[PDB]
Chain A
Amino acid sequence: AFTELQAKVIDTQQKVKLADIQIEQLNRTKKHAHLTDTEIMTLVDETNMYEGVGRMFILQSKEAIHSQLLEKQKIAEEKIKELEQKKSYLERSVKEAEDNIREMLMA
């Protein structure tokens, strides 16, 4: 029966679609969280520098920020691959049932 063969190709279809759009900004928000560090690295030192996780800008030493923000680089730096790991298998998984659709038809 091709129903679940048509059912699996629909679900894993929209599964893989997310890993493509996110991975690049994850490289960006990697690169930008390097840049925003370089952006505060622009002015050699300041107390009025802020890094924050919310509407609050909690006053922080840009140094600990350079760590935190290259850490924030490292945050989005990692998420590219776990998507690419998502991006890797899900592309094949949708065709798993599709491989079952067509062979049985070629059969």
Chain B
Amino acid sequence: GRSQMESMLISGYALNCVVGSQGMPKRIVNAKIACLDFSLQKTKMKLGVQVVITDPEKLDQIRQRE
């Protein structure tokens, strides 16, 4: 991209990542990096009450505790 003249060494590691900024901090410093090999993606609550689904109802009160 840009031009072969602007091709450059880059401070710190080369990082291609889907940018996490929804409003995430764009800059930080003294960064503790927690790199997640695993997705997070909303663990449910199936450990609490109402892990049983006979109805679409049982999805709601799981969605509050998750």
Interface positions of A (Cβ within 8 A of B): 85, 88-89, 92
Does chain A have a CB within 8 A of B43? no
A89 and B53 CA atoms in complex are apart in Å by: 7
Interface residues of B in 7-44 (CB under 8 A from A): none
| A19: min CB distance to chain B, Å | 13
B contact residues, range: under 10
| A85: min CB distance to chain B, Å | 7
Does chain A have a CB within 8 A of B49? no
Closest to A88 in B: B54
Q: Which residues of A contact B47 (CB under 8 A)?
A: none
A92 and B53 CA atoms in complex are apart in Å by: 10
Q: Which 6 A-B pairs have the closest CB atoms?
A: A89-B54, A88-B54, A92-B54, A89-B52, A89-B53, A85-B52
Q: Which residues of B contact A89 (CB under 8 A)?
A: 52-54
Q: Which residues of B contact A92 (CB under 8 A)?
A: 54
| B54: min CB distance to chain A, Å | 5
Closest to A90 in B: B54
| A68: min CB distance to chain B, Å | 31
A61 and B57 CA atoms in complex are apart in Å by: 49
Closest to B55 in A: A92
Q: Which residues of B contact A85 (CB under 8 A)?
A: 52
A85 and B53 CA atoms in complex are apart in Å by: 10
| A35: min CB distance to chain B, Å | 33
A92 and B58 CA atoms in complex are apart in Å by: 14
